[PDB]
C-alpha cells in the first residue's frame, strides 16, 4: 500500500496539482476519476508528479493506483481526493487551531500538513483573541507581540501570523474566532457604556454572564448585537484585527438562548432577531473579509439564514441527539436558507468520555461521519487533535492511527464525491432489498439493528447511501460514553433494486473499502427487477445508478 498526498487541500480552476508518494510499485497505474469515469490513465513512475485537472469549477475527482496482475485482477495501493474549488463555501470542510504559544515553525507545519492531508480548506483559529471585547493585543501602531488569553495562556503574534501564512500555502481560509458579544471585566468602561449591556432584569441591575471558573481570567459579559454603538466599536476592533493579521474572516460565535433578558431600557433584548443586523453591519465595515456564524442549537438559524454568512454552522446540543435529529438539522438549514448554503456541524464526539484523558471510539466517530457526510453535511472535528468538547483546547481524547487512517479515507470520500453528496438534487424512497438475506434493510430514520438505505437522485443518477446499523447499540450520535460497536463486515451481498428506467451503469464506492476507490457493478435487469452484489459493507457504502 501507498500512502498518496496532494500539495494543497483544494485548487483553484487553472491550478496544477502536485502528488507525493512515499514508494513506487510496479505494474502499476494511476486512475483519475469523476464520479466514477475515468478520465485519464497514466503510469505510475516518479514519486512525484503533476496533473492539471479539468477548468470546470467545483468538481470532485479521485486519483486512485492500482497494480495490474497478470490474471487481469487490480489491487488497489492507494487514493487520495480532490477538490477544484474557487471558493471554500460550495464545499466547506472546516478544521480548527487552538494553540498559540511559544510553537516552532516546523510544529505549525506539521500541523497544518495533515489538516491539509484531510483536504481541511478553512480553520477557525480559537481562543487567538486578545481579549472579547478587544481581539486585537495592542494598537494597529503598536501591536502587543505576546499577549495573555482569556486562559492567561501566553499567544505569539508571530505564531499567529505564521499560522495563517502556512494555511493560505495550501490555500486554506483563516477565520479568527470571537463572540458577536462579548466582554470581559478588563473592558474600558471610556468605551463601552452600561447602556450596551444586556441584564438578567427589566432595571440594568445584573448583566447576564457566561460563568467561568479557573484558569479563566474573567466572566463573559453580554452586549445587544442589535446597538449600533456596539456594532460600531466591534466593526473597529475586527478593522484593528485585519490589519494586523491576515485573517480572511470572523468565525463568530454566540452563547445561545439566554432565555429572561433585557436591554438596559427594561426592553426585550430578543437576541436571535439581533444577530440579522449585526451580521449586515460586520459585512459592510469589512466588505472583502468572509462571516460564518454559530447557531448554538439552532438558536438565530432560521433569522440568519439569508444574511451575509459563507455556510451555515450549527452547534448540536441536547434533544438533538439522535442520528435523525444530525439530518434534520441539514434538511432545515437548506430551508431556511433557500437552498444557498451548505452546513457544518459542531458535533462533539464521545463527550462524557472526554471528561477525562483516553482515545476516541473509533466506530461512533466513523458512523457518525457516514451520517453526516451521507446527507452532505460536513462536521467540524479536525485541528491540532480531534475535539471532544465545545472548548477546542481540550485535548483530553487521543484517535488511534486506525482512526486516522480511516478517517482520511472518509475525508477522501467526502470530497472525490462531493458532487454527488452536496451538489443539488432530491431526496427519494429507496425501493431497494436484500436478494440473499445477508443484511436486512430499513430506510431512514434509521432502525436499530438493520442497513439504513437512503435515496438521492441528483442529475441523472439515482444514489442510494446504506449506512449500517446492523450492530447499533444506541441511535444516539454522539457516543458519549464510547460505547458504540465496530460494525461487522457484511460481503457480497445481493440486492434488487426496483428501477423504471433502462440502467446503463452500476457501481458502488465505500471509504471502508478500496480506498473509495469506484468499482462498476455487474447486474441483470428482468422487467423493473435489477439484481447486483456489493462487495463490502462496514460503515457505509454508496451504489449508484446511471
Ligand atoms: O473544568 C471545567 C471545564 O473545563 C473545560 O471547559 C472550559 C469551559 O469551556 C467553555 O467556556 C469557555 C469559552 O467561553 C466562551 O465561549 C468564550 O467566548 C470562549 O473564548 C471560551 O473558550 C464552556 O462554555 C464552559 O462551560 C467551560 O467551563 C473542559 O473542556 C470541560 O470539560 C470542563 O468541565
Ligand atoms: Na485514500
Ligand atoms: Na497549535
Ligand atoms: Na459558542
Known amino acids: 500500500k501507498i500512502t498518496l498526498k496532494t500539495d494543497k487541500a483544494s485548487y483553484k480552476p487553472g491550478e496544477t496539482v502536485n502528488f507525493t508518494a512515499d514508494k513506487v510499485f510496479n505494474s502499476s497505474l494511476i486512475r483519475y476519476t469523476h464520479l466514477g469515469k475515468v478520465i485519464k490513465e497514466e503510469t505510475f513512475s516518479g514519486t512525484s508528479w503533476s496533473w492539471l485537472p479539468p477548468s470546470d469549477d467545483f468538481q470532485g475527482y479521485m486519483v486512485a493506483i492500482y497494480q495490474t496482475n497478470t490474471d487481469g485482477t487490480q489491487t488497489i495501493l492507494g487514493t487520495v481526493g480532490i477538490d477544484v474549488s474557487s471558493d471554500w463555501a460550495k464545499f466547506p470542510r472546516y478544521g480548527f487551531l487552538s494553540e498559540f504559544g511559544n510553537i516552532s515553525e516546523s510544529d505549525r507545519a506539521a500541523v497544518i500538513d495533515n489538516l491539509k492531508d484531510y483536504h481541511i ?167 472583502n473579509k468572509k462571516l460564518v456564524m454559530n447557531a448554538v442549537n439552532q438558536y438565530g438559524q432560521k433569522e440568519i439564514a439569508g444574511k451575509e454568512l459563507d455556510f451555515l454552522y450549527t452547534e448540536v446540543w441536547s434533544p438533538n441527539e439522535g442520528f435523525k435529529d444530525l439530518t434534520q438539522v441539514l434538511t432545515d438549514n437548506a430551508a431556511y436558507s433557500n437552498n444557498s448554503k451548505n452546513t457544518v456541524l459542531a458535533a462533539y464526539m464521545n463527550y462524557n468520555k472526554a471528561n477525562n484523558q483516553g482515545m476516541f471510539n473509533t466506530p461512533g466517530v466513523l458512523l457518525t461521519d457516514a451520517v453526516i457526510f451521507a446527507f452532505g453535511g460536513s462536521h467540524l472535528e479536525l485541528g491540532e487533535h480531534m475535539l471532544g468538547k465545545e472548548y477546542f483546547p481540550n485535548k483530553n481524547l487521543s484517535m488511534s492511527a486506525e482512526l486516522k487512517s480511516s478517517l482520511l479515507e472518509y475525508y477522501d470520500f467526502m470530497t472525490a464525491y462531493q458532487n454527488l453528496l452536496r451538489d443539488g438534487g432530491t431526496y427519494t424512497n429507496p425501493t431497494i432489498a436484500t436478494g440473499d438475506g445477508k443484511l436486512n434493510l430499513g430506510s431512514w430514520p434509521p432502525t436499530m439493528g438493520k442497513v439504513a438505505a437512503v435515496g438521492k437522485q441528483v442529475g441523472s443518477r439515482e444514489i442510494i447511501h446504506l449506512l449500517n446499523f446492523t450492530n447499533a447499540n444506541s441511535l444516539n450520535w454522539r457516543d458519549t460514553d464510547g460505547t458504540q460497536n465496530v460494525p461487522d463486515l457484511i460481503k457480497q451481498a445481493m440486492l434488487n433494486l426496483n428501477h423504471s428506467g433502462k440502467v446503463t451503469k452500476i457501481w458502488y464506492a465505500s471509504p471502508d473499502y478500496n480506498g473509495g476507490a469506484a468499482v462498476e457493478l455487474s447486474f441483470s435487469q428482468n422487467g423493473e427487477k435489477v439484481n447486483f452484489k456489493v462487495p463490502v459493507l462496514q460503515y457505509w457504502a454508496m451504489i449508484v445508478v446511471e
Open 121 to 287: 480548506n478553512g480553520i477557525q483559529f480559537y481562543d487567538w483573541q486578545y481579549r472579547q471585547h478587544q481581539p486585537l493585543a495592542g494598537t494597529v501602531s503598536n501591536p502587543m507581540p505576546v499577549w495573555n488569553d482569556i486562559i492567561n495562556r501566553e499567544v505569539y503574534g508571530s505564531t499567529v501570523s505564521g499560522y495563517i501564512a502556512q494555511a493560505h500555502s495550501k490555500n486554506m481560509k483563516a477565520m479568527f474566532y470571537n463572540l458577536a458579544y462579548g466582554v470581559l471585566n478588563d473592558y474600558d468602561p471610556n468605551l463601552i457604556k452600561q447602556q450596551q449591556f444586556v441584564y438578567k432584569d427589566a432595571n440594568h441591575n445584573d448583566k447576564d454572564k457566561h460563568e467561568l471558573g479557573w484558569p479563566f481570567i474573567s466572566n463573559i459579559y453580554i452586549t445587544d448585537p442589535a446597538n449600533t454603538a456596539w456594532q460600531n466599536y466591534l466593526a473597529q476592533k475586527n478593522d484593528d484585527v485585519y490589519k494586523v493579521y491576515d485573517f480572511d474572516g470572523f468565525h463568530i460565535d454566540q452563547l445561545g438562548d439566554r432565555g429572561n433578558v433585557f436591554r438596559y431600557d427594561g426592553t426585550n433584548a430578543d437576541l436571535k432577531n439581533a444577530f440579522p443586523s449585526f451580521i449586515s453591519a460586520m459585512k459592510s465595515a469589512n466588505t
